Amino acid sequence: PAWQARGLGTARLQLVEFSAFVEPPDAVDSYQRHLFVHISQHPPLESVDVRQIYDKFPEKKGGLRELYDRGPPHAFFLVKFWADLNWGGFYGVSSQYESLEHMTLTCSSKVCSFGKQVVEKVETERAQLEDGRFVYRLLRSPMCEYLVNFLHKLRQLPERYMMNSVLENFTILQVVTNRDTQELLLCTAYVFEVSTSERGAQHHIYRLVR
Numbered sequence: 202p203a204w205q206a207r208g209l210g211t212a213r214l215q216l217v218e219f220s221a222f223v224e225p226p227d228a229v230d231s232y233q234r235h236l237f238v239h240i241s242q243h244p245p246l247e248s249v250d251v252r253q254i255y256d257k258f259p260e261k262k263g264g265l266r267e268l269y270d271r272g273p274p275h276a277f278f279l280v281k282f283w284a285d286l287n288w289g290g291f292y293g294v295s296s297q298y299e300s301l302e303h304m305t306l307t308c309s310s311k312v313c314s315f316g317k318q319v320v321e322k323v324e325t326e327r328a329q330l331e332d333g334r335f336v337y338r339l340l341r342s343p344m345c346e347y348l349v350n351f352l353h354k355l356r357q358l359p360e361r362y363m364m365n366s367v368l369e370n371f372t373i374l375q376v377v378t379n380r381d382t383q384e385l386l387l388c389t390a391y392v393f394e395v396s397t398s399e400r401g402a403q404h405h406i407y408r409l410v411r
């Protein structure tokens with residue numbers, strides 16, 4: 202019917218902002234950051250069948266199929282990114298979410314290659330009540346050396362189509378849960394392409410359904 206999402210969020214937990222970036226060693230003297238990917242959230246979304254992408258994510262325990270069976274279904278999103286790979290500095294990742302309620306969150310980010318987990322970062326964040334809403338800040342988390350090395354390698358490939366072949370097998374799953382209750386709040390699958398040089402980062406957000 203309606204009650205379908207218009208952005209990457211639920212009624213309990215909206216994404217405010219996400220970005221992955223690099224600030225070069227000279228940012229100290231004149232500031233600059235490069236954004237590989239970026240979502241800012243300050244008509245319903247299109248949907249994609251989750252069965253179609255199981256094989257791109259880990260299986261057995263905390264993999265897509267069992268997370269979807271566990272549910273709740275309305276918390277599952279797919280982000281397609283066109284990443285801007287055109288730039289020993291600082292590689293970071295910043296997320297911010299908002300809720301009506303006070304929770305401690307667990308945020309897990311699982312990097313996967315050919316559908317199999319390679320690295321995983323798990324952080325927790327207690328709420329900070331601000332003007333009405335609660336807010337959850339995970340700003341400037343350092344990027345896993347895995348990704349940093351991946352990026353440098355990807356950057357050097359001589360053809361966009363090779364970058365996209367390589368990225369065809371590279372995925373990220375973000376799972377955010379209420380650390381106290383264990384309830385799942387947001388689950389986001391990321392699939393990746395490279396954008397062209399002078400087009401910067403873009404994205405498109407889908408609901409995951411079945």
Ligand SMILES: CC(=O)CCc1c[nH]c2ccc(OCc3ccccc3)cc12
Nearest residue numbers: 221237238284294310322342343344345
């Ligand atoms: C501390 C960590 O390592 C967490 C990293 C993380 C969580 N969600 C993400 C979504 C996208 C992303 O990187 C963008 C990218 C990756 C590969 C090629 C081009 C662009 C990184 C992350």
